[PDB]
Amino acid sequence: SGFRKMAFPSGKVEGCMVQVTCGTTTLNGLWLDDVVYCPRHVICTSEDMLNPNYEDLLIRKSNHNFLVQAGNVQLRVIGHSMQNCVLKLKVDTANPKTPKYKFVRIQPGQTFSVLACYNGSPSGVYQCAMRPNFTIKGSFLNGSCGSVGFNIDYDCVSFCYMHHMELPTGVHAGTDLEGNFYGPFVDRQTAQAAGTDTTITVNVLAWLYAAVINGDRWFLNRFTTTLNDFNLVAMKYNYEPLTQDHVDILGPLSAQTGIAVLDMCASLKELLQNGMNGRTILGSALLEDEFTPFDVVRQCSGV
> Residue 152 in 3-state DSSP?
strand
d(CA 284, CA 87): 41
Q: What are phi and psi of 269, to 5 degrees?
A: -55, -45
C-beta of 83 vs 214, nearer to a copy of itself: 214
Q: How far is the CB of 140 from ligand 5IZ (least distance, A)?
A: 4
Q: Tell me which of 16, 22, 38, 41 is the catalytic residue.
A: 41
Query: Hey, which bits of 65-142 come out as E strands?
Result: 66-70, 73-75, 77-83, 86-91, 100-103, 111-118, 121-129
Q: Parallel, antiparallel, or unpaired for β 156-166 and 172-175?
A: antiparallel
Cβ neighbours of residue 2 under 8 Å, at least 6 residues apart? 214
**Helical (H) or strand (E) element with 62:** none
**Helical (H) or strand (E) element with 209:** helix 201-213
Q: Is 45 in the site for a copy of itself (CB under 8 A)?
A: no
Which residues in the 123-142 window bind ligand 5IZ by CB under 6 A? 140-142
Q: Tell me which of 145, 160, 265, 300 is the catalytic residue.
A: 145
Q: Which does residue 27 touch among ligand 5IZ, a copy of itself, none (CB within 5 to 8 A, set by kind)?
A: ligand 5IZ
Which residues in the 185-214 window bind ligand 5IZ by CB under 6 A? 187
Identify the bridge partners of residue 39 per DSSP, sorted by sequence position: 86
Identify the bridge partners of residue 81 per DSSP, sorted by sequence position: 88
Q: Which of 215, 244, 258, 277 binds a copy of itself (CB under 8 A)?
A: 215
Size, binding site for a copy of itself by CB under 8 A: 42
Q: Which does residue 8 touch among ligand 5IZ, a copy of itself, none (CB within 5 to 8 A, set by kind)?
A: a copy of itself
Residue 41 a catalytic site member = yes
Residue 163 a catalytic site member = no
Query: By the criterion CB under 8 A, which residues form the site for a copy of itself?
Result: 1-12, 14-15, 115-116, 122-126, 137-142, 166, 170-172, 214-215, 280, 283-286, 299, 301-303
Query: By the criterion CB under 6 A, which residues form the site for ligand 5IZ?
Result: 1, 27, 41, 49, 140-145, 164-166, 168, 172, 187
